[PDB]
Design an enzyme around this catalytic site. Structure first.
Site: not given
Length: 260
Positions: A43, A46, A103, A139, A210
Site C-alpha cells: 500500500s 497509494k 489504506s 488491488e 503490508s
C-alpha cells in the site's frame, strides 16, 4: 558506520530482509541500508496514485470534486471507507483521502482507473524523475510480494527521493503539495510503525503498507521540533509466505536512525 551496524543487527535478529533510506534535508545527506534493492511496495504505492491525481488537478481545477460511483462490484478485500458509500458516490478527494489515511483498496483501484491503468501511475513516477518505481497490477493482487518478482516494487533510495520531491519539493503545485501533506499527517494506520520509534513531539506524515511474505512497510516525512525535516523509508519482507507482520521492526529501525 554505527547506524549501519545497528540496522544490520536488527535485520539479523528479525529473520527478514530490511531496507532503509533516510534523507536529512538539513544537509541533503543520506543513510541507506539495502538502498538499491527492490522491495514490494504494497500500500505504500497509494501515495503515487494520489499524487498523480493531484498533478492532474493542476490543469483540471475541479477534478478533486468529481463524483465517482461506488458499485458493489468495485469492492475488493479491504474497503473500510468505500463500504460506507456503496450505491452512492465519493469525490476523488474523498477517495484519495480514503486510500491514504485508511489504506482503502477500492479507493486505490478508482484512482488507478482515473489515471488510465497502472501504466498511468508508473508514467507519473517517470515524469517526476523516478525511473525505479513500477506499478503493474491493481488491488489486491499487487500485494503478493513474491520473492524475486519485480512487479509492483521500488527501492528505498528511489522512494525516499520521490517522497521528498512530492512533499517538501515542488513536483506538485503549492495547493496540491499542501493537500498531500495534510492527508499524510492525518494517516490513521501508522501508530505502531515509524511513529512508534520517534520522539512523541515530532510531527509525522506516513503511509504504511503490508502484504504477503510478512511484508511490512512505512514511508514517512518527519518534522522534528526546531530542526529541518527528514524523509524516512522502511521496507521489510520475510521468507515465509504466511509470515506475520512485523511493525515493531519498522519502529526499531526508526529509533536507530533517530539516535543519529
Amino acid at each position: 558506520s554505527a547506524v549501519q551496524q545497528k540496522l544490520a543487527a536488527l535485520e539479523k535478529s528479525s529473520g527478514g530482509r530490511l531496507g532503509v533510506a533516510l534523507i536529512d534535508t538539513a544537509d541533503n545527506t543520506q543513510v541507506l541500508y539495502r538502498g538499491d534493492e527492490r522491495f514490494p511496495m504494497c500500500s505504500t504505492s497509494k501515495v503515487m496514485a494520489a499524487a498523480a491525481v493531484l498533478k492532474q488537478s493542476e490543469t483540471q481545477k475541479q477534478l478533486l470534486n468529481q463524483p465517482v460511483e461506488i458499485k458493489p462490484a468495485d469492492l475488493v478485500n479491504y474497503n473500510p471507507i468505500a463500504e460506507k458509500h456503496v450505491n452512492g458516490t465519493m469525490t476523488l478527494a474523498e477517495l484519495s483521502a480514503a486510500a491514504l489515511q485508511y489504506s482503502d483498496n477500492t479507493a486505490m483501484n478508482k484512482l488507478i482507473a482515473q489515471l488510465g491503468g497502472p501504466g498511468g501511475v508508473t508514467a507519473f513516477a517517470r515524469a517526476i524523475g523516478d525511473e525505479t518505481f513500477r506499478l503493474d497490477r491493481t488491488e489486491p493482487t499487487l500485494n503478493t510480494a513474491i520473492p524475486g518478482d519485480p512487479r509492483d516494487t521500488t527501492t528505498p533510495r528511489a522512494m525516499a527521493q520521490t517522497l521528498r520531491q512530492l512533499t517538501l519539493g515542488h513536483a506538485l503545485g503549492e495547493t496540491q503539495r499542501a493537500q498531500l501533506v495534510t492527508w499524510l499527517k492525518g494517516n490513521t494506520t501508522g501508530a505502531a510503525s515509524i511513529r512508534a520509534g520517534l520522539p512523541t513531539s515530532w510531527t509525522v506524515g506516513d503511509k504504511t503498507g503490508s502484504g504477503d511474505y510478512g511484508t511490512t512497510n512505512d514511508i514517512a516525512v518527519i518534522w522534528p521540533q526546531g530542526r529541518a525535516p527528514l524523509v524516512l523509508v522502511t521496507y521489510f519482507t520475510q521468507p515465509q509466505q504466511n509470515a506475520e507482520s512485523r511493525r515493531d521492526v519498522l519502529a526499531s529501525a526508526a529509533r536507530i536512525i533517530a539516535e543519529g
